[PDB]
Amino acid sequence: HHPPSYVAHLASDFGVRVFQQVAQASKDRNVVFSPYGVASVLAMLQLTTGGETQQQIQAAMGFKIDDKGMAPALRHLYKELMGPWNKDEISTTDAIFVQRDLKLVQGFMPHFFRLFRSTVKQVDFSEVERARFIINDWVKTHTKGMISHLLGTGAVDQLTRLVLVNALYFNGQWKTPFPDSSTHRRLFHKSDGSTVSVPMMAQTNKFNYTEFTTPDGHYYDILELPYHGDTLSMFIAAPYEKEVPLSALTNILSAQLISHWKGNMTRLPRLLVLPKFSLETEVDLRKPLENLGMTDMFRPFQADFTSLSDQEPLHVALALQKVKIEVNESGTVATAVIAPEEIIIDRPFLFVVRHNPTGTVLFMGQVMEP
Numbered sequence: 445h446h447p448p449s450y451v452a453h454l455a456s457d458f459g460v461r462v463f464q465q466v467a468q469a470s471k472d473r474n475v476v477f478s479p480y481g482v483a484s485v486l487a488m489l490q491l492t493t494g495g496e497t498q499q500q501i502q503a504a505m506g507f508k509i510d511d512k513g514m515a516p517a518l519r520h521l522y523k524e525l526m527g528p529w530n531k532d533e534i535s536t537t538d539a540i541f542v543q544r545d546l547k548l549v550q551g552f553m554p555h556f557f558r559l560f561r562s563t564v565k566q567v568d569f570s571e572v573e574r575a576r577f578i579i580n581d582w583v584k585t586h587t588k589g590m591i592s593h594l595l596g597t598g599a600v601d602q603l604t605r606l607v608l609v610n611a612l613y614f615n616g617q618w619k620t621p622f623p624d625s626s627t628h629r630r631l632f633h634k635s636d637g638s639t640v641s642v643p644m645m646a647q648t649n650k651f652n653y654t655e656f657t658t659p660d661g662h663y664y665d666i667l668e669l670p671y672h673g674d675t676l677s678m679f680i681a682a683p684y685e686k687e688v689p690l691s692a693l694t695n696i697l698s699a700q701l702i703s704h705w706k707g708n709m710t711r712l713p714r715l716l717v718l719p720k721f722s723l724e725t726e727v728d729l730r731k732p733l734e735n736l737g738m739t740d741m742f743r744p745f746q747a748d749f750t751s752l753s754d755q756e757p758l759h760v761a762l763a764l765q766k767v768k769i770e771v772n773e774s775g776t777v778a779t780a781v782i783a784p785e786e787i788i789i790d791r792p793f794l795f796v797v798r799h800n801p802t803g804t805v806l807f808m809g810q811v812m813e814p
């Protein structure tokens with residue numbers, strides 16, 4: 445079962461469904477994504493919407509941001525996730541940018557700040573280069589410089605009126621780092637049958653482990669790798685057989701399934717071999733969100749943003765997420781156990797970064813080639 449945090453389940457379930465749309469349109473390429481991040485910035489966007497645009501977002505997310513206690517619970521979740529100290533291992537930021545001289549509904553801006561403790565950001569898009577710089581500089585200054593540019597800002601021009609962005613960086617310190625000395629080159633088998641020699645880490649430990657089956661009965665392994673805070677973990681999932689494609693797993697993912705993986709795990713002594721990886725993804729959220737039914741928000745004269753402004757037309761010109769994640773021997777900072785059963789992750793695999801106290805799915809991705 446999920447831990448008791450209802451808003452974490454809501455955010456994660458919606459974010460995982462968005463990820464599935466991204467992965468389906470990216471069949472055999474690397475993707476990293478943040479379910480929590482997309483849910484957080486669309487929860488904020490809910491407050492700007494009205495009419496059928498609002499109904500589409502609320503239906504797809506499964507809640508209304510204005511409902512009693514919902515925004516405070518999201519603010520409490522944010523604090524629980526981001527409050528604890530970390531070794532510059534994680535950074536996130538959300539931003540909604542709106543044309544500076546649009547007449548805003550009276551009371552909107554204070555109401556947004558009351559619910560979210562952050563502001564919608566007014567920008568003059570007629571000064572195209574300055575607007576592009578402001579958006580990129582916001583992301584650079586709120587990710588500690590780890591993400592400094594969105595390529596999607598190349599679409600910002602003098603006609604832009606409403607932009608949303610979410611950017612996250614993650615590079616966590618394992619509870620038990622992999623020994624530097626055990627890293628080594630090993631063949632990785634790609635989905636097309638070709639191979640590539642890549643650096644892989646290795647360590648022997650007692651790992652939380654479970655074996656599940658897909659609805660077609662293919663076995664797959666799931667391992668938990670805890671981070672040092674004892675609160676975050678990375679789950680690694682891959683089919684046992686090389687001939688089973690990773691889509692067999694991504695097509696059935698859900699927040700509920702991930703909680704079931706964790707509930708069924710026991711700790712087994714194993715030699716784990718895992719590729720290092722450093723992935724960055726920037727995704728235009730329009731098509732994934734349209735596929736979940738949020739079509740009006742992207743269409744001029746159909747989008748309804750009347751809680752934010754009565755000016756027409758007004759629609760989302762740009763909705764971007766950019767995530768950068770590093771998996772290495774010990775995260776952001778600098779002994780081998782010397783024969784047990786081995787689990788060798790030498791084919792495409794899924795990863796999930798999960799906050800265990802709440803169930804929050806912070807990151808998710810598919811490594812098709814490290």
Ligand SMILES: O=C(Nc1cccc(-c2ccoc2)c1)C(=O)Nc1ccc(Cl)cc1C(=O)O
Pocket residue numbers: 553554555557563564565566567578582
């Ligand atoms: O704050 C704003 N506009 C505003 C207008 C009317 C009322 C209120 C308000 C807030 C609470 O109560 C009333 C805010 C704003 O444009 N900010 C920003 C713009 C650009 C950038 Cl790059 C950053 C920010 C920021 O804020 O970091």
